[PDB]
Structure formats: C-alpha cells, structure tokens
C-alpha cells in the first residue's frame, strides 16, 4: 500500500483545472514519506519511538509530502509552471 498504491492513487486522480480569466492547473507527481516523527511544543522534529506513542497516547504516524506542479495560463499564450517540492 505505501510503496505503490499511494503513488498510483495520487497519480491517477484527475488534474485540477479552474477558471472564473486566468486558467489554473494543478498536478500531483511524486510522493514522499519520512519516518515517524514527533513535533514537540516548540515544533522540533524528533524520531517518534512506538513505546513513546504507547505511553503518551500519541499516534505512531509519519508525515506525507507531495510535489505539486501549478501551471497558470494568463490567456496570452504563456504558461508559468511552478513546482512546490515536498508539500
């Protein structure tokens, strides 16, 4: 599920395209998973051991990131394509 199905689920989803005017397009391409990480009150990442999750009533989960390519067309035969990495 993690290695293949998540990637295929994001990839086969329809690309978003919107208009009111400038056309906007959004596309999800690549997926990233870190290890299970805990953010403290200050917000510092640290590796979350599962025993800490058991004791502190946390959830032994890892964050999910996706590279999002936004392509905006301003009806002038130009396409500005900006790729946000690790969203």
């Amino acid at each position: 599920f993690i290695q293949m199905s998540v990637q295929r689920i994001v990839e086969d989803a329809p690309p978003i395209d919107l208009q009111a005017p400038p056309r906007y397009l959004l596309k999800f391409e690549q997926i990233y998973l870190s290890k299970p990480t805990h953010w403290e009150r200050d917000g510092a990442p640290s590796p979350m051991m599962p025993n800490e999750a058991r004791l502190r009533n946390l959830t032994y989960s890892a964050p999910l990131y996706v590279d999002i390519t936004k392509t905006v067309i301003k009806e002038g035969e130009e396409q500005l394509q900006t790729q946000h990495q690790k969203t």
Binding site: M4, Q7, I31, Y32, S34, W39, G43, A44, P45, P63
Partner: peptide, 16 residues
C-alpha cells in the same frame, strides 16, 4: 515508487 526522506531534509515549516 515512493521516495524516502531522511529527517534532515524535513524543513522546519511545520513549526512556522
């Protein structure tokens, strides 16, 4: 396939 990221490549955006 899904790439793995080490903990050092996680920017401190979750705190901002």
């Amino acid at each position: 396939g899904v790439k793995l990221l080490d903990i050092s490549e996680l920017d401190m955006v979750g705190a901002g």
